[PDB]
Scaffold this active site. Structure first.
Site, PDB file in Angstrom:
ATOM      1  N   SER A 197       9.739  -3.875  -4.180  1.00 32.09           N
ATOM      2  CA  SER A 197       8.744  -3.491  -3.188  1.00 32.09           C
ATOM      3  C   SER A 197       7.392  -4.090  -3.554  1.00 32.09           C
ATOM      4  CB  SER A 197       8.663  -1.964  -3.068  1.00 32.09           C
ATOM      5  OG  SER A 197       7.665  -1.559  -2.153  1.00 32.09           O
ATOM      6  N   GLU A 324      15.411  -0.423   5.052  1.00 35.55           N
ATOM      7  CA  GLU A 324      14.113  -0.411   4.386  1.00 35.55           C
ATOM      8  C   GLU A 324      13.180   0.625   4.990  1.00 35.55           C
ATOM      9  OE1 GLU A 324      13.575  -1.751   1.703  1.00 35.55           O
ATOM     10  OE2 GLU A 324      15.092  -3.335   1.553  1.00 35.55           O
ATOM     11  N   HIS A 437      15.141   2.402   1.190  1.00 34.03           N
ATOM     12  CA  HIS A 437      14.208   1.626   0.391  1.00 34.03           C
ATOM     13  C   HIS A 437      14.142   2.166  -1.029  1.00 34.03           C
ATOM     14  CE1 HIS A 437      10.333  -0.520  -0.402  1.00 34.03           C
ATOM     15  NE2 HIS A 437      10.031   0.586  -1.062  1.00 34.03           N
TER      16      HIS A 437
END
Ligand SMILES: ONCc1nc(CCCCNc2c3c(nc4ccc(Cl)cc24)CCCC3)ccc1O
Ligand SMILES: ONCc1nc(CCCCNc2c3c(nc4ccc(Cl)cc24)CCCC3)ccc1O
Ligand SMILES: *[C@@H]1O[C@H](CO)[C@@H](O)[C@H](O)[C@H]1NC(C)=O
Ligand SMILES: *[C@@H]1O[C@H](CO)[C@@H](O)[C@H](O)[C@H]1NC(C)=O
Ligand SMILES: *[C@@H]1O[C@H](CO)[C@@H](O)[C@H](O)[C@H]1NC(C)=O
Ligand SMILES: *[C@@H]1O[C@H](CO)[C@@H](O)[C@H](O)[C@H]1NC(C)=O
Ligand SMILES: [Cl-]
Lengths: 532, 532
Positions: A197, A324, A437
């Site tokens: 990320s 995500e 995510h």
């Protein structure tokens, strides 16, 4: 001794930690910069001054000053990403796991946590490196860097608050690995940085930054990439939020010197408590203080550096999760709940869409909208919710990453793309949220492999071969072994654009990940918004 | 006497034509206006001056001066559409088919031929009215009207050449039916205008035009709508095209009076031979002289009338064929051949869309391109050609019509919507063309009932129940016979917007005809083009 290692800044004494049926060495909380406090808030790190005697490196260090998610108190799924130790500005430390016995000159994997550049810790249980270091005979480092305004407040021009000092933090740790990993049996020539990320955007930015290119060999990027829309700001917008942060705290605003001196006297949580009030829009998946494109850490625009090939040439391995966006809808977008199926009335769908592309004009909003609705069934609460989930995923991670993987491959020396989509059996969030995510990380760090965490036998296997993929990639620059019967994970090439599924089924190759929505996101809507 | 009839303008004598092992009486080439010759070229029609004696009305009349298609000399598939009689500016004649014995006061259907307002004949083989008048016991009328420049040269302000006079030919024929149909046993209170392509557009525009509302009862529209992008122009465009026609013939271009003067001395084919040189762009599915939104025939813009409800409230019957555009790509877009599968390379595909949306800015071009492209397969010759088919089909017929059918249904007293998609077994054209623009007409007019034309028994049945739909709708205002056993064609309602398939199989109901593409063509793309 073996647990006593003498670096160029001083001696450190580790500890013999057990990992499954056995033990390995760990050196936790090793200083790598001078503590950045007082006058030294918002400034470039300074390398830790050498110490006398033996630094006790047997317990995790402190976490940096950061926002603390309290939406779901007690909830492990959100608590697992919050800091688990004390939070200090004195937080620039790293941790090393070494296989025991100490090997000579072995591969090194530096982990870089993410968390939107506003949060994240080196010391979380998901980043517990004893499993992967042990099972794949690698030296694992995990660093830390300042986050939020501490790491990225930016008054470009001033040398007191330049910005990107969080990325400069992690470059200092990399430069520490360069000079001392050899004293732990790390090969400073076989270093792989990898991050998720924000951490993956970070990996990307080191690939791009000339001041960082010589401090590592290869790169893994998971669900993050240097060109993400949330991952950077212009100096002007960086300045603006810097300035408005002063306005929230009733600071003097005429010059940077006065502004910064005002901001350096505030207690750290006074800063955190107003950090979100500087964002220019009502938005999801956007964070206040992020990297700047200042011209120094980044010579020019990220697009131009990708086009000219002005970046590090090597092999990258990288990929994305299937869902995500579900995490960010659950926090910022109406109609979604943790405890319900979260079907979304169409009215909330529009509210959701305008939240997801805060920057678009009306016409672009319509484009995004027409692009993701099934007009035979627009009041179908599910297709709308999946609708939004794909929007924020495609807009903020997947298509940004794919744009990067196409640009980089014109010039790199190897590219391996993956698509992780394994709904864990023991997961805590509801099913609508899918492959969350961040939840690939358990498999990278081998957490399915301890039997007390109650994982299926399959996820264990999938964790063991992802670790091998990662580790083997870190050793050879190719995640497949040369004997190894089945089953080769193909190179990603400009024309054929192949990739593989990461999950419990036998591996399958696919071409053009999300090509259809990514044409929309990488070429069309950019064009629409420029011209309108 | 049955074949001798005394109308308000003179006496007519008809002919006893055989039909399907019986006979009926036809009255052919009946004049309804003064010949628009010499100083009457381009001007509003004048009602036929009354004649003396008996008019020998047993032969078809001449066809109007129009462009003739020589692309495939000898090929029945195209010569089916060309004039089959001599051409003359003296062309304004209708044709009547009356059942025999004569009805007392029975339903009248008035066919309005199409041909892009540049071509078309009332006397084509495929518009032979004897079959449908005989089979469903209706008075079938088939009118004529000037086409191309003779029918629609448009210099607003000038009353020597106002424009829309081709549509006024129609309405004058419509009032002739009003005043005289009763003498053939027709009922002027139960008149149904119906036409295809340019015809259907016209049918459309009589329901808009006040001077037309009261000259018929119902309306059938086939593959044509008043709001079609090719169906009309503004006065500004209509005049610049009138003027550019004069430029193409060395005319005096200072006033209109001299302009129109110069033009009426030219021989008709001198107008035809340059006709096309006047379009604004290299395009497909666009025609030189078409109706003008003048402010008299059309009191305001078509959209304002559709929204405000400013049209006639009745029942309409309308629909489209599956592959409206295939004919038009064969004639105008690169890589289409009559003798091939016309697999379209991608560089030809985008020549295609540019030709297909000639008024689009480039941003509009990419919008159209990405919405009809399978980006996992962009060089798939089939899908590109299939794709381009849908583009011109959806943009020029399908979606305009649906816009009209939704706008109209908010105010009319009954909408019935159809999707013809039967590929006739004995079709001469290649199968990549599918259900070609114009080939439902053979079924409307009952030609499958002729055995020597070698239609399948299943095609005969579809023709028989199609004419019944058409005819039953023309009298009752509803396709179906109430409380009868056959499956029932459901009304099109604003909320469920149902429609059915016309073909050999048992009837299907569907919902929202091609909404997703139509949402693009009707709401988003027009919005994209307004902005810069
Ligand atoms: O979504 N709007 C708000 C919102 N409030 C909350 C309440 C708890 C802390 C508030 N902190 C935040 C504020 C704002 N945006 C944020 C976005 C994500 C996150 Cl974790 C915190 C944010 C924008 C300005 C106001 C504060 C939780 C989630 C949330 O999203
Ligand atoms: O596109 N189909 C056919 C096509 N034929 C031709 C030549 C054959 C017949 C001539 N007449 C025409 C001319 C022009 N455009 C036309 C469009 C549609 C139709 Cl039927 C006839 C047209 C453009 C200006 C020149 C003449 C040229 C281009 C072309 O495109
Ligand atoms: C190192 O620190 C830990 C943490 O409290 C402590 O328990 C341990 O005794 C220390 N060891 C030495 C040798 O100082
Ligand atoms: C990597 O570089 C070597 C030498 O520069 C070259 O032979 C090889 O083909 C390259 N491989 C890839 C996948 O780019
Ligand atoms: C009308 O024209 C047809 C066509 O030639 C002819 O056979 C017929 O005898 C004509 N009738 C009269 C009354 O002139
Ligand atoms: C048509 O109008 C009549 C009265 O004018 C009304 O009762 C009827 O329901 C309407 N039919 C449709 C299909 O709208
Ligand atoms: Cl087809």
């Amino acid at each position: 001794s073996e647990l006593l290692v003498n670096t160029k800044s001083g001696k450190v004494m580790g500890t013999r930690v057990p990992v499954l049926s056995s033990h390995i060495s760990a050196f936790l909380g090793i200083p790598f910069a001078e503590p950045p406090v007082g006058n030294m808030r918002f400034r470039r790190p300074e390398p830790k001054k050498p110490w006398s005697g033996v630094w006790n490196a047997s317990t995790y260090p402190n976490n940096c000053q950061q926002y603390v998610d309290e939406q779901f108190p007690g909830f492990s799924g959100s608590e697992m990403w919050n800091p688990n130790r004390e939070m200090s500005e004195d937080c620039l430390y790293l941790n090393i796991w070494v296989p025991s016995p100490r090997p000579k000159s072995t591969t090194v994997m530096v982990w870089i946590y993410g968390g939107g550049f506003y949060s994240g810790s080196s010391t979380l249980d998901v980043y517990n490196g004893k499993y992967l270091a042990y099972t794949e005979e690698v030296v694992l480092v995990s660093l830390s860097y300042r986050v939020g305004a501490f790491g990225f407040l930016a008054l470009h021009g001033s040398q007191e608050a330049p910005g990107n000092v969080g990325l400069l933090d992690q470059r200092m740790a990399l430069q520490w690995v360069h000079d001392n990993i050899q004293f732990f049996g790390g090969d400073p020539k076989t270093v792989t940085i990898f991050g998720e990320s924000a951490g993956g955007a970070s990996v990307g930015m080191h690939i791009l930054s000339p001041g960082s290119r010589d401090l590592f060999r290869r790169a893994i990027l998971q669900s993050g990439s240097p060109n993400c829309p949330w991952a950077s700001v212009s100096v002007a917008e960086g300045r603006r939020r810097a300035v408005e942060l002063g306005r929230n705290l009733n600071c003097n605003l005429n010059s940077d010197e006065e502004l910064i001196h005002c901001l350096r006297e505030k207690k750290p949580q006074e800063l955190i408590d107003v950090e979100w009030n500087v964002l220019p829009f009502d938005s999801i998946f956007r964070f206040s203080f992020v990297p700047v494109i200042d011209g120094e850490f980044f010579p020019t625009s990220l697009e131009s550096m990708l086009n000219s090939g002005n970046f590090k040439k090597t092999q990258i391995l990288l990929g994305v999760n299937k869902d995500e966006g579900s995490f960010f809808l659950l926090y910022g977008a109406p109609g979604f709940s943790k405890d319900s199926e979260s079907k979304i009335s169409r009215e909330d769908f529009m509210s959701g869409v305008k939240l997801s592309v805060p920057h678009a004009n009306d016409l672009g909003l319509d484009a995004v909208t027409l692009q993701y609705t099934d007009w035979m069934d627009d009041n179908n609460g599910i297709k709308n919710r999946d609708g939004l989930d794909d929007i924020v995923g495609d807009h903020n991670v997947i298509c940004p990453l794919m744009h990067f993987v196409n640009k980089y491959t014109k010039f790199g020396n190897g590219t391996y793309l993956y698509f992780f989509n394994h709904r864990a059996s023991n997961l805590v969030w509801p099913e609508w949220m899918g492959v969350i995510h961040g939840y690939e990380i358990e498999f990278v760090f081998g957490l399915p492999l301890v039997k007390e965490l109650n994982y299926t036998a399959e996820e264990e296997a999938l964790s063991r071969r992802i670790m091998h993929y990662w580790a083997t990639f870190a050793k050879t620059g190719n995640p497949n072994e040369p004997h190894s019967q089945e089953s080769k994970w193909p190179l990603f090439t400009t024309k054929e654009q192949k990739f593989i599924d990461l999950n419990t089924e036998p591996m399958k190759v696919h071409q053009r990940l999300r090509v259809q929505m990514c044409v929309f996101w990488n070429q069309f809507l950019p064009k629409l918004l420029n011209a309108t």
